[PDB]
Amino acid sequence: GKEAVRANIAAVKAVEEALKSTYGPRGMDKMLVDSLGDITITNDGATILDKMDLQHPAAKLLVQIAKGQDEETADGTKTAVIFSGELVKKAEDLLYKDVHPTIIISGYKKAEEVALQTIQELAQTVSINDTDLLRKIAMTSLSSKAVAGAREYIADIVVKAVTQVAELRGDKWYVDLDNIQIVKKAGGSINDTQLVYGIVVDKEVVHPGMPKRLENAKIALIDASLEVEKPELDAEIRINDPTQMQKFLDEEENLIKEKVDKILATGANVIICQKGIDEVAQSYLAKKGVLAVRRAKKSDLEKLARATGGRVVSNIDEISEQDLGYASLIEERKVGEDKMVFVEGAKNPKSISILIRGGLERLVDETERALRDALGTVADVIKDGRAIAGGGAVEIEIAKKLRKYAPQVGGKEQLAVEAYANALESLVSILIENAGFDPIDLLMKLRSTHENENNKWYGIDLYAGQPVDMWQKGVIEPALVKMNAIKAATEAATLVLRIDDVVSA
Amino acid sequence: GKEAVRANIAAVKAVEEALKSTYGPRGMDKMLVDSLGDITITNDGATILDKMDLQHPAAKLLVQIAKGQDEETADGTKTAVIFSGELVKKAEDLLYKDVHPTIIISGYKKAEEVALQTIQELAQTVSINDTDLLRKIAMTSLSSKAVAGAREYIADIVVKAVTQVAELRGDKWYVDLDNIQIVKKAGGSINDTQLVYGIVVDKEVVHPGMPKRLENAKIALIDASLEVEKPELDAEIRINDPTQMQKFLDEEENLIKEKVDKILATGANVIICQKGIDEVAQSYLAKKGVLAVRRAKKSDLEKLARATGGRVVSNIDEISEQDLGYASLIEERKVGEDKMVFVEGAKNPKSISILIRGGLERLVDETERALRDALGTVADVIKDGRAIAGGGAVEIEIAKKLRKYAPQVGGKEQLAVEAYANALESLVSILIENAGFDPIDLLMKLRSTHENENNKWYGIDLYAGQPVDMWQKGVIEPALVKMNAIKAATEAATLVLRIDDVVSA
Ligand SMILES: Nc1ncnc2c1ncn2[C@@H]1O[C@H](COP(=O)(O)OP(=O)(O)O)[C@@H](O)[C@H]1O
Numbered sequence A, B: 001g002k003e004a005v006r007a008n009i010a011a012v013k014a015v016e017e018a019l020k021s022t023y024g025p026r027g028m029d030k031m032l033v034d035s036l037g038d039i040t041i042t043n044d045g046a047t048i049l050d051k052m053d054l055q056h057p058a059a060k061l062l063v064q065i066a067k068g069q070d071e072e073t074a075d076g077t078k079t080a081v082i083f084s085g086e087l088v089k090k091a092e093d094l095l096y097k098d099v100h101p102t103i104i105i106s107g108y109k110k111a112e113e114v115a116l117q118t119i120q121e122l123a124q125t126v127s128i129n130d131t132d133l134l135r136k137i138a139m140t141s142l143s144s145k146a147v148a149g150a151r152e153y154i155a156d157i158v159v160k161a162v163t164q165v166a167e168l169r170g171d172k173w174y175v176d177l178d179n180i181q182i183v184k185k186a187g188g189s190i191n192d193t194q195l196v197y198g199i200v201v202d203k204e205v206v207h208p209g210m211p212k213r214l215e216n217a218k219i220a221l222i223d224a225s226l227e228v229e230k231p232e233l234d235a236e237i238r239i240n241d242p243t244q245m246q247k248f249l250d251e252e253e254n255l256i257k258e259k260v261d262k263i264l265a266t267g268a269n270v271i272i273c274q275k276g277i278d279e280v281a282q283s284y285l286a287k288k289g290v291l292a293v294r295r296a297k298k299s300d301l302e303k304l305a306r307a308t309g310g311r312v313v314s315n316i317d318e319i320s321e322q323d324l325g326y327a328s329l330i331e332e333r334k335v336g337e338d339k340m341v342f343v344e345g346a347k348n349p350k351s352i353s354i355l356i357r358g359g360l361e362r363l364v365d366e367t368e369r370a371l372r373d374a375l376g377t378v379a380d381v382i383k384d385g386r387a388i389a390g391g392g393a394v395e396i397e398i399a400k401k402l403r404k405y406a407p408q409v410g411g412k413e414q415l416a417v418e419a420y421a422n423a424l425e426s427l428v429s430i431l432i433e434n435a436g437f438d439p440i441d442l443l444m445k446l447r448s449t450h451e452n453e454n455n456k457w458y459g460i461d462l463y464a465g466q467p468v469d470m471w472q473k474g475v476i477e478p479a480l481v482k483m484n485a486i487k488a489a490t491e492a493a494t495l496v497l498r499i500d501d502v503v504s505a
């Protein structure tokens, strides 16, 4: 009964109160200071919840549904939760009127149904051919984050980056984000960032006496120990004369050269690994004319593996005339400050990376967040093929269309549905609020400007304060992201109500 | 006297107050947070009592009778207890009137008798031939749990799954649930779950160089250590020259190959065990063309043992030309995300398994609960052969029929019986309550609609709020489950009253 159910609700409303002021494209920012001392300020939902530990079960339950939503991009999780808590709020008012929660559930379900198809039988068909459209959908996502200086630059990139990896595995597209690497290093402004048509390794070469530019390379992904073997563990021993010394360090030096020749046995122009490479073994590779790289996060070896059609050598005594990937040109431009290795024109085409350079140690970090989400979302538009105008446009519609529905739904459930609708408009008010305008004023002024059947795409320009056509202003979103959000929010919302009591161990 | 007897009752009523709000098919849900931090919300009685530690003796005594009821399925234990506590409540009112508890006992006994046969001489004869009926009885059980999306899918499965294992050992059916394995792994929705006509092992093959598909296999259930023998415990020793090394690791490697050949001595296409298999022994089995699996819960070896007509090899030096089971086709489809081994078309027909895939790490878990109970109950319908319409239909009947009985029973005992009846209707009110309708209103409106001798199967549709024919709406239950419940509840109920005082050590 009311006992605990109030608590869960409480907790949920609580989570809402944590993002509410950051919703919308011109929302606020929350600050986060690591215990280490480092500060990071943002308005990315995932981060605001990952870095913010909540304890109450209901809450972990809400976020579990929100973050681990139904798809790629992190977008809409912020909606999923806000809208989620709003249903809870507006549902609370129903319990006050004494309507069994089981009813508010059915009410919401039926409302969800309609609310949902109302997006389908309204969404517009977007095809990856139309490149001038995604140019917008991209900004409609990244323009939302801190970094809003010359976004067209980043926006444009994001579009090319995805269309590059896309495929048509049986008239059914499949964009695998893993085919894109993202590396970042301080320096200049964000305009100094660019996309490379191949993998990019952030780690300077091992020795200066090595080829800093190979034509038609044959990469050798060697993952294993490549340094003189400490021989102390194997043996503890004494020594007399210098005659013994020589033959000791000589063959021991020849032991590493063995692994090296056994690898060059495939004849590779370049060889990179993820462990410490001996300094004596460098002079050897240097004299051989090989290009080698020290420790390097396995995280990129893989992305570089299937990007150059090679294998990540497990055991050196097993290397094959094929485990080595091919390329076209390797380089090491000292871009920014440090020097990085490039592997442009790989064997595998659909495989590129992006290089972020925000400038400051932290500004760069959040550019990566925005970019991650930006890419994800764009890929989702393609994987599906439906896209609607964002701006609260779909909210008010889902509302109105819902109000005309309620009347017939039934006795009490009606109230549930009428509610589901009101809670939903609350969504757009919050959006207005953060814009700095009277939420009620514009909401009424907008839901009014939706009488004209030819305004479906009308929303509220958060800079001029007035209803305008969102679509014809470059503001679109994956009709699926803001759709799964609704399924999500309602899932959570009705789930909290389904709960009668909590007993833990 | 009143002294302690109040306490026990108190405790019992207490247990009722813990499930009451979860009774019925549209009941509430209770939340459970493990001390580890993980949360599980449910309305399955067993779980609500297992995960909820009660201390008072009476309570452990009630649940002992309830859980360890009289049969398979966990269903009705929730009834057994609620109804149990209701008799206690309504019996308490009798003590208030000063009627020795010994009398309330006899009262209840005699009422139980009648209440019981009233189900027999009223139940309808169901035969396993009628497959279109169990299609319902299954839903009448699983539709009750959280997972209510496309249940017809699961419901249908459950029916085929049992009829598959059923037997007629001397015109007396015997369904052994153990002949059905249940494996679960996240991924997609629940619609992505299916039943396999043979055992299914959740564990990827041991080596990539092995046959991932054998025609007509001869399984070898080898339960024992299959890895190079650590020789340190056996011996501690020194070493000089490399001549000694070779003959050491060589024969030691040949030691494991021995066990392998001694097993292949039966000539098996596949061999799986429940321990760690050496990596060198893999290269051997790989070169031999055998399909082997690493550690695997003994829990499935057995289900796979008598499912393929083989023995679980205790000692490798004892394997026989028969201890190995036969099959038809083994496979390893990467269904979902990970890869699992299948053993379809085994030697033994009546032996299948079910694969659950709810999607989320927890959603999948409760689908297994619902499914377990769902299977159990269906099997019980067959083992017996009698089934009645659920929906409170039988309650009100057992009531009415009971009221006409009371008058003749006797002086005081009458009140006991009239009570036994009232307490029983309370059962259906609780059911109504959770539906969101006035318990009294409908109960009277329903027990009224039972004047018409042709409505016996009439109950209250918990979605429209009105008496309708439950039977003709696909709502049936094992006339035995809701029968043993009554025996159970009354057992417990009268047992608490039989107690005069508790003295512990
Ligand atoms: N340019 C824009 N003009 C008006 N509304 C916008 C614009 N961009 C996004 N929105 C609205 O903001 C809503 C929420 O997005 P946002 O606040 O960025 O975080 P999230 O996508 O995680 O909810 C979406 O409903 C959306 O249509």
Ligand SMILES: Nc1ncnc2c1ncn2[C@@H]1O[C@H](COP(=O)(O)OP(=O)(O)O)[C@@H](O)[C@H]1O
Residues within 6 Å of the ligand: B022, B023, B024, B025, B045, B074, B075, B076, B077, B078, B079, B080, B140, B144, B389, B390, B391, B392, B459, B460, B461, B462, B470, B474, B475, B477, B482
């Ligand atoms: N579809 C239905 N319509 C009406 N009553 C139902 C339906 N399904 C089950 N019931 C009633 O619910 C009662 C209790 O079942 P339930 O609440 O699921 O848990 P348990 O079986 O453990 O008591 C049974 O008496 C039963 O007939």
